[PDB]
Amino acid sequence: LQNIIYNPVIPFVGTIPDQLDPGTLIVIRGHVPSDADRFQVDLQNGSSVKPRADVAFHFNPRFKRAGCIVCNTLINEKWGREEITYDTPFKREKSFEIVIMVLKDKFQVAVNGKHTLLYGHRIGPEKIDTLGIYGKVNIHSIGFSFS
Numbered sequence: 324l325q326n327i328i329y330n331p332v333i334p335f336v337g338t339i340p341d342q343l344d345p346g347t348l349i350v351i352r353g354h355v356p357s358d359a360d361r362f363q364v365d366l367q368n369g370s371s372v373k374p375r376a377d378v379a380f381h382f383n384p385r386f387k388r389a390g391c392i393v394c395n396t397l398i399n400e401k402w403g404r405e406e407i408t409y410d411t412p413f414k415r416e417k418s419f420e421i422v423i424m425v426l427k428d429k430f431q432v433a434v435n436g437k438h439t440l441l442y443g444h445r446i447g448p449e450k451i452d453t454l455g456i457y458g459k460v461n462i463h464s465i466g467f468s469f470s
């Protein structure tokens with residue numbers, strides 16, 4: 324992998340060092356603490372907080388009850404229609420690997436080597452230049468494979 328970041332402080336906000344062209348991978352390895360409620364991986368158009376940077380792809384594992392993953396997009400500080408996946412591989416106290424693959428029409432995400440979900444583009448992926456990781460999660464490494 325390319326442009327690897329080790330043991331970042333959370334919240335992490337970093338510039339993605341090349342374009343997210345089809346076939347590009349974002350690989351995030353970490354673990355979920357025992358008290359986690361949720362965490363998220365946000366692919367953003369910049370890092371502004373005011374107005375808040377648009378979020379092309381919000382990938383949001385939630386741990387209450389049986390758990391799920393919520394995905395959405397934030398445009399001009401308004402969330403769109405949530406996409407929910409109930410078949411969640413994440414668990415408190417367990418390590419994980421997330422691989423986000425950028426495709427022409429969508430993202431595809433695999434967790435722990437297994438296909439997890441698709442998310443159709445709502446913002447042009449060319450507008451994504453920033454990776455945010457927030458919430459109750461421990462990140463070991465972030466790396467990229469650019470196409």
Ligand SMILES: [Cl-]
Nearest residue numbers: 363365381457
């Ligand atoms: Cl948020």
Ligand code: NA
Nearest residue numbers: 365375455457
């Ligand atoms: Na945020």
